[PDB]
Paper text:
Abundant filamentous inclusions of tau are characteristic of more than 20 neurodegenerative diseases that are collectively termed tauopathies. Six tau isoforms that range from 352 to 441 amino acids in length are expressed in adult human brain from a single gene by alternative mRNA splicing. Here, we report in vitro assembly conditions with recombinant tau that replicate the structures of filaments from both Alzheimer’s disease (AD) and chronic traumatic encephalopathy (CTE), as determined by cryo-EM.
We found that reducing the shaking speed from 700 to 200 rpm was important for the formation of filaments with the AD fold by tau (297–391). To show that this was not only the case for tau (297–391), we assembled tau (258–391) and tau (297–394) with a shaking speed of 700 rpm. When assembling tau (258–391) at 700 rpm, we observed protofilaments with partial similarity to the GGT fold. The structures were nearly identical at residues 288–322, with an all-atom r.m.s.d. of 1.5 Å, (filament type 38a). It is possible that the absence of a non-proteinaceous co-factor, which was hypothesised to be present inside the GGT fold, precluded formation of bona fide GGT filaments.
Residue numbers in the entry:
A (entry chain B), B (entry chain C), C (entry chain A): 270 to 330
The structure:
């Protein structure tokens, strides 16, 4: 079974305001290997995010 | 089984205000590998996100 | 089983404001190896993120 190609030109400029930031929780992702087997068995997200702010954005006074 | 070609030119400029930000929770994603097998068995998302804010956007005084 | 190709030109400029930042929690990711086997069995995320802030963004006087 034939191998494929993945290419990712991820070009990012980030000037954002975030209180709490988490990355992805993807299970199976970017598989160009031919005849390969990926299993994710009973993956669970029970995570808790609590965020409190008075004010968040920019002023530009 | 022939392998495919995946290409992503993700070009992102981010100036946003976000209180709580979480990435994707995709199960199977971008599989160019020919004859490969991807199995996500019983994935569960029970995560809790709580967000509280006084004010969030920009002022531009 | 044929091996594939993965290439990532990650070009990130980051000037953002973040209180709490967590990386990704992806299970299986970027597999160019042909005939390889990846198994993630019962992965669980029980993490607790608590974030409190007075003010978060930029002033730009």
């Amino acid at each position: 079974p034939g191998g494929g190609k993945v290419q990712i030109i991820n070009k990012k400029l980030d000037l954002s305001n975030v209180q709490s930031k988490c990355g992805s929780k993807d299970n199976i992702k970017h598989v160009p290997g031919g005849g390969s087997v990926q299993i994710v068995y009973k993956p669970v997200d029970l995570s808790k995010v609590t965020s409190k702010c008075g004010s968040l954005g920019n002023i530009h006074h």
